[PDB]
């Protein structure tokens, strides 16, 4: 097995994703070895997803010959599930990312959003607390919990957060459709 | 690749060790397929060590 292939696979397993803008050489090594990486990850019940438009290589749980797996009972999964509040915040972040991406052209940039901008939009849904400090602490806690899943980054000195591109594959229209159907079933009974 | 061999490899890579007293099936599958385990773990730069005195199957960084 080539050294580059093994190093790229190990790094991707360690971090969960590979981005060309950060690790271009590893991205090139892994992109040209789709069959090799697939063969390596087949015994481990894992699969590789490629987005050359966004230059992202991610690892997902391989779908076996089982009708229902819940995608969280896999032994190597350590993340916790997502509740409704986190899902709503992720949907808001995805809308903001869509807005950022639509008016985007050639060049390198990042999706940065301030907390104060997100404050009223989430206040519309959750409600309003007595003090601004309480709402700010709630937002900080939610952002920290979501950063524990690798979706955002730590807050900067100017009260901003950066949205990772993986949400695009997290909020793909298929998963959005499944979540919408589940929510419709939950509300209606 | 046999399903039992894949299950034993997954368990060994997850928990880092295999005991016959706890998982006799996986221990027997890996013990009788040492060459298969070595071939599987070679691309991962890993090797399997067996201590049949205590039925202990562990992983070492081959180099």
Automatic annotation (TrEMBL), chain A:
<protein>
    <recommendedName>
        <fullName>DUF4194 domain-containing protein</fullName>
    </recommendedName>
</protein>
UniProtKB/TrEMBL annotation, chain B:
<protein>
    <recommendedName>
        <fullName>DUF4194 domain-containing protein</fullName>
    </recommendedName>
</protein>
């Amino acid at each position: 097995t080539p050294q580059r292939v093994r190093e790229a696979v190990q790094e991707m397993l360690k971090y969960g994703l590979l981005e060309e803008s950060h690790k271009p050489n590893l991205y090139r090594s892994a992109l040209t070895n789709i069959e090799v990486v697939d063969r390596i990850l087949e015994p481990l019940d894992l699969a590789m997803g490629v987005d050359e438009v966004r230059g992202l290589v991610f690892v997902t749980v391989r779908q076996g010959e089982v009708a229902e797996q819940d995608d969280w009972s896999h032994p190597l999964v350590r993340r916790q599930r997502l509740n409704l509040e986190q899902s709503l915040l992720i949907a808001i972040l995805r809308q903001h990312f869509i807005a950022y991406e639509q008016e985007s052209g050639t060049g390198a940039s990042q999706a940065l959003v301030a907390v104060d901008e997100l404050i009223p939009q989430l206040q519309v849904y959750l409600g309003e607390l007595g003090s601004e400090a309480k709402e700010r602490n709630r937002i900080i806690t939610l952002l920290d919990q979501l950063k524990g899943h690798g979706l955002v980054s730590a807050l900067d000195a100017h009260d901003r957060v950066i949205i990772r591109p993986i949400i695009t594959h997290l909020a793909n229209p298929e998963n959005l459709q499944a979540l919408v159907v589940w929510l419709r079933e939950q509300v209606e009974g």
